Amino acid sequence: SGSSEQELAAIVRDLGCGPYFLGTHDKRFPGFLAGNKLACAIVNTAGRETGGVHWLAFGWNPRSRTCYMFDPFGFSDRRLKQIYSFEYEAMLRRSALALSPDRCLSLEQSTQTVQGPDSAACGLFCCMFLHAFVHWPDRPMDGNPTMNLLTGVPNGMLQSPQVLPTLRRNQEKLYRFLAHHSPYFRSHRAAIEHATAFDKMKQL
């Protein structure tokens, strides 16, 4: 169910993220502490011991002092804390203290889902976002060749019928994008598309 950390590490590398990528972690990701460089990561909502639950993408732009948090589902921090028991306040504090002279940062996050409610492609959408983030770090969420390929829908509409055709088309365009840019995705395509299926949570 979903993408493994090796799967994501290989795809992220294939996407041209490697030099700016800090790895794949669990909820205990410390933050952007090393230096004031373009940096990103893939962080799980849960601790490694639980086995993993959901994937999130975190980016740092030093020329705007912005931390981008990408939840493919566009849940608010309040909803992330409720649904997934995930909080990243300490992460934001450690980061702004380590990299911001004024001790302030801008937290930019999605309010729209790109993912169907039963889909297990969260890790893969995180890869796509990090591709958009490393190529357009000043505006990674939308208005760039990579995120222009997807159609975000208000998060509040996640469980509604009118949006499944859009959320499925997103998932098909996700695969097509990854097959175009990642040899690792191409090689493991059948196992990746099946384990991250649009309907995977119903097919447990």
């Binding site: 912005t66 566009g74 934001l92 504090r93 702004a96 203290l97 004024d102 001790r103 302030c104 940062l105 801008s106 937290l107 930019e108 996050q109 999605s110 309010t111 729209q112 790109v114 958009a132 969420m141 939308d142 208005g143 760039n144 995120m147 222009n148 997807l150 975000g152």
Partner: peptide
């Protein structure tokens, strides 16, 4: 793409 919300956080 997705619509976003930008918030300033100071520590």
């Amino acid at each position: 793409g997705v619509k976003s919300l930008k918030r300033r956080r100071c520590y």
